Design a protein around this ligand. Structure first.
Ligand SMILES: *[C@@H]1O[C@H](CO)[C@@H](O[C@@H]2O[C@H](CO)[C@@H](O[C@@H]3O[C@H](CO)[C@@H](O)[C@H](O)[C@@H]3O)[C@H](O)[C@H]2NC(C)=O)[C@H](O)[C@H]1NC(C)=O
Ligand SMILES: *[C@@H]1O[C@H](CO)[C@@H](O[C@@H]2O[C@H](CO)[C@@H](O[C@@H]3O[C@H](CO)[C@@H](O)[C@H](O)[C@@H]3O)[C@H](O)[C@H]2NC(C)=O)[C@H](O)[C@H]1NC(C)=O
Ligand SMILES: *[C@@H]1O[C@H](CO)[C@@H](O[C@@H]2O[C@H](CO)[C@@H](O[C@@H]3O[C@H](CO)[C@@H](O)[C@H](O)[C@@H]3O)[C@H](O)[C@H]2NC(C)=O)[C@H](O)[C@H]1NC(C)=O
Ligand SMILES: *[C@@H]1O[C@H](CO)[C@@H](O)[C@H](O)[C@H]1NC(C)=O
Ligand SMILES: *[C@@H]1O[C@H](CO)[C@@H](O)[C@H](O)[C@H]1NC(C)=O
Ligand SMILES: *[C@@H]1O[C@H](CO)[C@@H](O)[C@H](O)[C@H]1NC(C)=O
Ligand SMILES: *[C@@H]1O[C@H](CO)[C@@H](O)[C@H](O)[C@H]1NC(C)=O
Ligand SMILES: *[C@@H]1O[C@H](CO)[C@@H](O)[C@H](O)[C@H]1NC(C)=O
Ligand SMILES: *[C@@H]1O[C@H](CO)[C@@H](O)[C@H](O)[C@H]1NC(C)=O
Ligand SMILES: *[C@@H]1O[C@H](CO)[C@@H](O)[C@H](O)[C@H]1NC(C)=O
Ligand SMILES: *[C@@H]1O[C@H](CO)[C@@H](O)[C@H](O)[C@H]1NC(C)=O
Ligand SMILES: *[C@@H]1O[C@H](CO)[C@@H](O)[C@H](O)[C@H]1NC(C)=O
Ligand SMILES: *[C@@H]1O[C@H](CO)[C@@H](O)[C@H](O)[C@H]1NC(C)=O
Ligand SMILES: *[C@@H]1O[C@H](CO)[C@@H](O)[C@H](O)[C@H]1NC(C)=O
Ligand SMILES: *[C@@H]1O[C@H](CO)[C@@H](O)[C@H](O)[C@H]1NC(C)=O
Ligand SMILES: *[C@@H]1O[C@H](CO)[C@@H](O)[C@H](O)[C@H]1NC(C)=O
Ligand SMILES: *[C@@H]1O[C@H](CO)[C@@H](O)[C@H](O)[C@H]1NC(C)=O
Ligand SMILES: *[C@@H]1O[C@H](CO)[C@@H](O)[C@H](O)[C@H]1NC(C)=O
Ligand SMILES: *[C@@H]1O[C@H](CO)[C@@H](O)[C@H](O)[C@H]1NC(C)=O
Ligand SMILES: *[C@@H]1O[C@H](CO)[C@@H](O)[C@H](O)[C@H]1NC(C)=O
Ligand SMILES: *[C@@H]1O[C@H](CO)[C@@H](O)[C@H](O)[C@H]1NC(C)=O
Ligand SMILES: *[C@@H]1O[C@H](CO)[C@@H](O)[C@H](O)[C@H]1NC(C)=O
Ligand SMILES: *[C@@H]1O[C@H](CO)[C@@H](O)[C@H](O)[C@H]1NC(C)=O
Ligand SMILES: *[C@@H]1O[C@H](CO)[C@@H](O)[C@H](O)[C@H]1NC(C)=O
Lengths: 416, 112, 120, 126, 431, 423
């Protein structure tokens, strides 16, 4: 009675993991990488999403690390820096705690043996007045090329032909389960690859309420990602006007040293308005209690270097800050500046970040938090590390599927 | 599944469009997947068609739903799931039928 | 091969095969990419013909009419004293209008054929 | 591994039987540091497409078996159908007439060009 | 059957000989484990070609050449991101190790001291280590055998060089024809041919003179050579029974890890916990004597039933039996295995150890094999021999032999290219 | 007029200007032979095709330029780095029968070099040209501290074997066969080719050696004839044969400098020490300029006095390589007088070569063993300009002079046209 009819162009898909490519709108590592320049509602589609099993996250993690190594690889290696270093403290017009924060060091570089001097931050140098540069003894330290910019630009991930990205439009999607408002895109919204710990900067805000997401809200071994529906503005400054000192290393090889500070020396810091923070934290707890129980009063606590302090790259210089006081007109967080950076969670090669001349100021939006758990009232602390959570906070609404446009069904016809 | 198949071209077209090795892998794969589907249609006698009738009967074993209901208040996603264990079977049957049909045509054409 | 390029259309339309077979036959990454690109370009053109009722044809006739706003010439004017190079310039525009029309016609034709087949 | 079954099973059989296993051979084409593997994959595609293009040029697209309008020349082979078919294997056949394949392919293309023109002229009202 | 027409057939089961690129595949930290990234079943299915006779040739088999290239390339790749020992290219001060040493070994081990770099470029350290005699030469100052030729790279201690079976698989459009003939001499027609997608799984075992852990003949001893009367060619002998061989380095060694730079480590021989005894290998007498007699019988088949067959020793890497046991390199004497004339409980082979290894007859590269702790013992299956030949009715054979190790496993395979189009006459024509 | 329908045609002979990557091929230890492994002469005339050809806007040249730089840089990657040679040299004058024209030309320099095995040094010496070192008897190498110097591997040949550029599938190379074509504009004698048929990648300044000749007339080409900011490329219709020599029987002194590395020093010179000059026939040169001027006048006037002048203040000389050695010949003896048996030119030699226009990434050219001669053809000139007018002698232009006739186009086989058929 019925016969097999073959149909091509059938609108059917399956979960899949593939390689996505980068695109952008218009020296910056992502600008030289993302050479590709750069929605449809599905009326009755109910798809299952799971942000913690999403391989798009892994793709960013891998691509970002590879891009960084690719960019830092062809730069001068600071071989002659692993020498006995001699140091004394900086005592010139220092505002009280930066006492003991800055050191004045000298060494013999490759007759040669040229004696040079430079300034270092305390966190960069370890004693054996005899010192060594931190971690140069366990791994090579290379200098980042000063012409390379790591400023985050929006990155769009785009599907290869034959694949599509499904997006969840549910205003309150909590990271897992079915979503009844599904649309298809070819490219994701732009995501800025901002790297930070504890507080997530310059992301996308929730549209209606605070959304608290985790793999298991009752498992204290997992991080809780909190997406705010309003941003909090944070203003971070490095108040000291420093200069840079160019030191010849070899045959066209140059080292960039921190030079002397011009004018007075003042402590680095970040500040947030009190009212904004107070209401923001209030929004979080109102909703946090929906998972933990009522009859509770607001209470937080501070952290247990990159995990216990806030970390971000400020104006191109690595900047760390003390978040205590946010979790316990404006609040000021003291901050520290560090060179010799072990990125992510590696304990291998470190990068030397050259200094930036002049006073550095940056203003950014706090869009979310990473919290962990310590009746027993509220006992939450800032958490962080790994940096995959930083992308889960943006990619949670996207899924990649494979299109397989060929199938069969019974029909009334017969081939003659 | 009727409305869903009013046009089979918008989703059929542009499936060939637009270190660095991974970009090549993405491109090579897109071509291979495209060709594999075209290869299969060719050997079933459906080259150049989006919709084609065949000489393989539909078995109640594969599905016992009537044409009504299958083709109306349903879609392709659950349809594909329901018969997902028979695709190897159906494809094998289509291949055998096409081969015999071409032989039969060759003989009739030679006879007249 | 391209010896007919200076010949008029209709003469230059003969032995189209010589220009077809030679599309596939006659550090190292650049050459690998070149091979991939030639394949993709070949297939993009074949898919375009394939989605029309022109699969496996060198000369394909279909049901899309001229509206006489595109060519703006008669057949003596077009198929004589004119090369393919000149023609391509004369109608360089409107190209995608025609392609869209060719696709729509083909989708309608296929649907009609399947119902005629079934209802017999 | 369901596809790789019967592949070349007919290779030692006569042409008369082997002609019925064309699908089996065809379905095993394509299918199947990392610095040579893409060349292997690209080549498989290129070889596949060259064969498909050629069938298209000859007007045999979409078929495993196609008849042409070209007569067989006794100079390529003077054997009768009963000695070629149901007797020789395809390998034996291929070891013969290998000197005339280019001749045959060339004239098949010319025939198709005549047919493409004749169809354009006869599809017209006349 | 007149007025016949051309018919074109696609999917025609024919092929032509061809060379191509093969894939690395395997079953289910190691050089090959991370190369074969394609899973495949052991014992892959075969399609028998019931009426096909095909011509095989073990020599001029490109599969062998491709394997040779792949093994070398992988070796070099895995060795590339490792510690260079250039800082070790210094003058050494050495004395003899004679604390608890047995005889036949005095002078084999030396206690060498030197001035090595440290994490800082302005610091130096005095360190010492033990070395084997073969790798240390006179300028009591000594030099390593390297520096005079090339640089040496330390093998990464974290990666295994142990062989695992690897399978070679055809790319789409190609096929591998396997010869199932029980007894063919590597060339000529084969009347039992099957088609496979992948080879049976070859362990890339590297050795000289004696072929270890290969595939045994299912019946009799098979002797194969390119040209049996040409003394310039080697003879590959495939046995139908394994001869079991026990290889060992009985000394209990320690490893002294020396930091030489910023995350750069050198692994030195530290000291010996027990006494010092010579490395060796053991072969059963009855098995060897009978095994050799089987070879002799098959040689008479080609050289005369009234001739005399002699086994003599070889004329370091191609003179001794080289192998890698437990990850350490051995160079064992074969004298006593080839010590007989054939007319009408066990043997012990003394072994020497080198730490500095060059491979595949290359001079411009060298590898430092870090020591391994503990005591080494392994047991291998001797599956074949590589033999050579010197008016006279008496003929002398000797151990010998690079690619022979793989040629002896790939002898059953040929790669061909599928040619799916063809034409034939029939009675069918277009309307 | 009525009842016309769209038909499509595949295999239509049309094309568009295009930019693609061309591949190299060659005819049978050479640097290009290793790269251009593909073996390789079809040409199809297009009877009624006129096409626009160009120069200076031609990307085939840019591809060739890039390939050459790349090949050289790649070639030197695995070669010995002469890193431990920024030492003070103790240099005295070489006085062994040195002729009058080169009394200060050679130095005898001794220094402390690192040996293999790290612990020892050796005292070695080598000869240098006065253009290789800097006095501060206290000398240092020129520019070894702005860049490490890489020694070219002595086994690699840089002989400029003809290179064939070939189109990739889907592309074709069109050639202009107009014998008098003045570089750019429409050409009415056009043919299609698969490959360029072999261009010798000869590197030089001022004079173009071993290139193509014009068949009937000397052709003068420039992007802008009227400007003074463009080079004038002159293609001769007859070659001028030029001899070059380096008659000093130096030997190669091989110095081990490390654990498997060797440096090749200039050793003692056997015999008397003389210049390394080049010889041009007087009549040929005098006639050659007369031919150029007669054609040059077409743009300047027949009552205009034309004068040839010397070099303006590597480029003020004629740079070329011969026998593997680098020559810097004085062309002041050429390009003289006004228009309205042989000449011998002196040449200098250098071992540290900054190729093309780069500051660092310098190369050390090891000396060749023995004595060389080379005979080359002058096939063209590069000239510049400052009532009456003057002309003076003056890298891409070396290839623009060879690839002016080629264009790459992309084939687009699918066409659309009206007729009277449908279904
Ligand atoms: C969050 O987003 C804001 C706004 O896009 C980021 O602020 C911007 O940061 C860049 C990099 O430091 C500033 O660029 C620099 O400006 C100075 C101006 O004197 C110029 O001399 C430098 O060459 C460079 O172009 C940019 O001006 C600044 N934008 C604003 C409005 O102040 C912020 O850095 C982001 N936060 C994080 C953690 O990524
Ligand atoms: C020929 O094949 C035999 C196996 O049939 C190989 O002998 C075995 O080699 C492995 C790999 O080195 C040995 O494994 C080791 O065992 C120790 C514990 O005893 C463990 O600590 C090591 O990490 C490793 O897993 C295995 O014990 C050994 N078998 C015997 C009987 O000793 C032989 O090596 C192969 N021949 C050649 C030349 O490769
Ligand atoms: C213009 O073309 C001529 C040839 O027509 C070039 O001269 C030739 O250059 C090659 C390579 O430098 C010389 O070959 C070498 O000869 C020595 C002899 O001992 C041998 O040892 C080398 O292995 C190699 O074979 C060839 O002899 C020489 N020909 C002549 C007549 O001297 C000339 O260099 C080209 N001009 C330019 C600027 O490229
Ligand atoms: C620098 O300050 C530290 C305390 O911060 C002190 O221990 C050290 O001795 C001081 N060094 C000098 C040279 O004053
Ligand atoms: C440089 O070397 C000299 C060697 O005598 C030493 O006295 C001096 O302290 C060194 N200087 C530094 C800053 O390391
Ligand atoms: C999202 O889902 C809710 C479910 O109640 C529905 O009311 C709303 O209209 C949907 N919005 C969109 C954009 O589909
Ligand atoms: C969630 O966490 C609680 C913590 O006690 C555990 O008992 C429960 O099994 C977990 N559930 C899942 C699905 O992981
Ligand atoms: C807050 O930060 C700003 C920098 O934008 C600084 O000028 C201001 O003084 C800080 N607030 C206080 C109380 O110091
Ligand atoms: C940050 O700076 C802006 C002006 O750029 C100012 O309006 C805002 O109040 C500052 N925020 C804080 C926390 O001081
Ligand atoms: C958290 O606050 C307590 C307050 O006494 C302090 O002692 C502790 O060091 C702080 N921890 C961190 C990581 O800032
Ligand atoms: C939080 O820190 C501030 C710092 O000034 C302190 O005054 C306040 O009492 C602390 N609150 C709690 C709940 O610990
Ligand atoms: C396919 O077979 C499996 C066997 O476990 C069964 O669970 C599944 O429901 C079957 N699917 C269909 C579409 O029948
Ligand atoms: C070129 O044009 C002339 C015009 O008289 C014509 O005779 C000739 O056949 C044409 N050639 C080609 C190749 O079409
Ligand atoms: C093998 O040859 C015999 C000859 O009688 C034939 O009958 C048989 O069918 C052939 N085998 C195959 C597989 O065709
Ligand atoms: C090996 O071949 C000989 C031939 O004489 C036979 O006697 C012996 O049994 C065979 N051994 C095996 C394991 O087949
Ligand atoms: C080889 O070692 C095994 C270990 O079980 C032993 O049984 C066998 O007898 C040994 N053979 C020789 C020749 O030592
Ligand atoms: C070891 O081999 C050498 C030849 O390389 C031979 O002279 C010596 O006698 C052998 N050792 C023994 C124990 O025979
Ligand atoms: C080489 O070194 C010695 C000291 O070891 C010194 O006396 C001699 O002058 C040096 N010679 C040169 C050419 O540098
Ligand atoms: C670099 O070398 C030149 C000699 O070529 C010398 O005059 C100059 O002083 C040196 N400069 C440095 C920084 O060593
Ligand atoms: C150079 O060319 C431009 C056109 O590209 C022209 O306008 C200009 O006048 C030319 N220069 C001279 C000196 O004529
Ligand atoms: C140039 O001519 C002179 C004439 O005496 C001759 O000695 C010299 O060798 C010639 N040089 C060349 C390069 O031919
Ligand atoms: C150049 O060398 C050739 C060698 O045959 C010679 O005949 C010719 O006269 C020389 N030319 C000059 C100007 O010396
Ligand atoms: C060329 O020869 C003519 C002969 O009359 C002479 O007047 C003219 O000055 C010469 N020019 C040069 C450049 O030698
Ligand atoms: C070239 O020769 C002329 C002849 O007068 C001379 O004045 C000039 O200085 C020479 N060139 C150089 C670089 O010495």
């Amino acid at each position: 009675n019925l016969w097999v009819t073959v149909y091509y162009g059938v609108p059917v898909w399956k979960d899949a993991e593939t390689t996505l490519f980068c695109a952008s709108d218009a020296h910056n590592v992502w600008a030289t990488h993302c050479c590709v320049p750069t929605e449809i509602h599905l009326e009755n589609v109910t798809e299952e999403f799971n942000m913690w099993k999403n391989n798009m996250v892994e793709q960013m993690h891998t691509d970002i690390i590879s891009l960084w190594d690719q960019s830092l690889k062809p730069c001068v290696k600071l071989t002659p820096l692993c020498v006995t270093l001699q140091c004394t403290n900086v005592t010139n017009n220092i505002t009280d705690d930066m006492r003991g924060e800055l050191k004045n060091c000298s060494f013999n570089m490759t007759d040669k043996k040229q004696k040079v001097y430079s300034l270092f931050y305390r966190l960069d140098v370890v004693q054996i007045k005899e010192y060594r540069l931190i971690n140069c003894n366990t791994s090579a330290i290379t200098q980042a090329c000063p012409k390379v910019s790591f400023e985050p630009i929006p990155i769009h991930y785009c599907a290869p032909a034959g694949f599509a990205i499904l997006k969840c439009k549910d205003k309150k999607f909590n990271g897992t389960g079915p979503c009844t408002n599904v649309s298809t895109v070819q490219c994701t919204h732009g995501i800025k690859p901002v790297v930070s710990t504890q507080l997530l900067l310059n992301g996308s805000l929730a549209e209606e309420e605070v959304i608290i997401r985790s793999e298991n809200i009752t498992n204290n071994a997992k991080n809780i990602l909190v997406q705010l529906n309003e941003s909090v503005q944070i203003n971070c400054t490095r108040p000291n006007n420093n200069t840079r000192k160019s030191i010849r290393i070899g045959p066209g090889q140059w080292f960039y040293a921190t030079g002397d500070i011009i004018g007075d020396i003042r402590q680095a810091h970040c500040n947030v308005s009190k009212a904004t923070w107070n209401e923001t934290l209030g929004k979080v707890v109102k909703q946090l209690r929906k998972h933990f129980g009522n009859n509770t009063i607001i209470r937080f606590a501070n952290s247990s270097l990159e995990v216990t302090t806030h970390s971000f790259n400020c104006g191109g210089e690595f900047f760390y800050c003390n978040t205590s006081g946010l979790f316990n007109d404006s609040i000021t967080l003291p901050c520290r500046i560090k060179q010799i950076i072990n990125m992510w969670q590696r304990i291998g090669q470190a990068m030397y970040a050259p200094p930036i001349q002049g006073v550095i100021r940056c203003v950014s939006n706090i869009t979310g938090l990473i919290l962990t758990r310590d009746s027993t009232t509220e006992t939450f602390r800032p958490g962080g590390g790994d940096m995959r959570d930083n992308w889960r906070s943006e990619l949670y609404k996207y899924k990649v599927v494979k299109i397989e446009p060929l199938g069969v069904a019974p029909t009334r016809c017969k081939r003659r | 599944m009727g409305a869903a198949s009013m046009t089979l071209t918008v989703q059929a077209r542009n499936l060939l469009s637009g270190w660095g090795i991974k970009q090549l892998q993405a491109r090579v794969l897109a071509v291979e997947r495209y060709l594999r589907d075209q290869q299969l249609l060719g050997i079933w006698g459906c080259s150049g068609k989006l919709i084609c009738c065949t000489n393989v009967p539909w078995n109640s074993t594969w599905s016992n739903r009537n044409l009504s209901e299958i083709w109306d208040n349903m879609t392709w996603l659950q349809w594909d799931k329901e018969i997902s264990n028979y695709t190897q079977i159906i494809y094998g049957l289509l291949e055998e039928s096409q081969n015999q049909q071409e032989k039969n045509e060759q003989d009739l054409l030679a006879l007249d």
